């Protein structure tokens, strides 16, 4: 439905496809950004162990510290998702 | 200049005023959100030890895991800032 565009990833490309998919699911289930973000953080906390953090929104800038190979930042249609492991 | 409104804080109110001030400085120096966020994260990494993470923007939702008494989420005029320690 929404065009996934990965803009920056320090992350195995298996995990990338999984990120993009887990976030497709979040957008199919939830309409509000904080609820989308919660679905992805909790799914990644489960599928890949903690501690992940997730920001979903249309206008934001970020600066964060993420364990190597545990960062991704992609759009889904207009909505941008930031997902990373402390 | 911009009206600070703290919307949620798990944080000593000393640190809260410092957060709000460090972010006032960021908005006086930088115009782009990722650059504002970088100024606050780095200043907090310095003034309070790592590891902090910072999101600055007008439209986003979040879900994150933060050490207790190391979270704040406030507006500055229209711009919302999220600052927390992994």
């Amino acid at each position: 439905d929404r065009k996934a565009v990965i803009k920056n990833a320090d992350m195995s490309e298996e995990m990338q496809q999984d990120s993009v998919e887990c976030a497709t699911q979040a957008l199919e289930k939830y309409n509000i950004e904080k609820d989308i973000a919660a679905h992805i953080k909790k799914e990644f906390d489960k599928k890949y162990n903690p501690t992940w953090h997730c920001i979903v929104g249309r206008n934001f800038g970020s600066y964060v510290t993420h364990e190597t190979k545990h960062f991704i930042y992609f759009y889904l249609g207009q909505v941008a998702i930031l997902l990373f492991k402390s | 200049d911009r009206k600070a409104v703290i919307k949620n804080a798990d944080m000593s109110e000393e640190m809260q005023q410092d957060s709000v001030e460090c972010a006032t400085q960021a908005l006086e120096k930088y115009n782009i959100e990722k650059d504002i966020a970088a100024h606050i994260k780095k200043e907090f990494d310095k003034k309070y030890n790592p590891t902090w993470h910072c999101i600055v923007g007008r439209n986003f939702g979040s879900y994150v895991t933060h050490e207790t008494k190391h979270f704040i989420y406030f507006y500055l005029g229209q711009v919302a800032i999220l600052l927390f320690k992994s």
């Binding site: 803009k7 920056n8 320090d10 929104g57 249309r58 206008n59 934001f60 800038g61 970020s62 600066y63 964060v64 510290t65 993420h66 364990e67 190597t68 960062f71 930042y73 941008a80 930031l82 990373f84 | 782009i32 959100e33 990722k34 966020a37 970088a38 590891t51 923007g57």
Partner: peptide, 10 residues
């Protein structure tokens, strides 16, 4: 190990 990252929405 750690690494720092920056993002900006378009």
């Amino acid at each position: 190990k750690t690494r720092n990252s920056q993002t900006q929405t378009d």
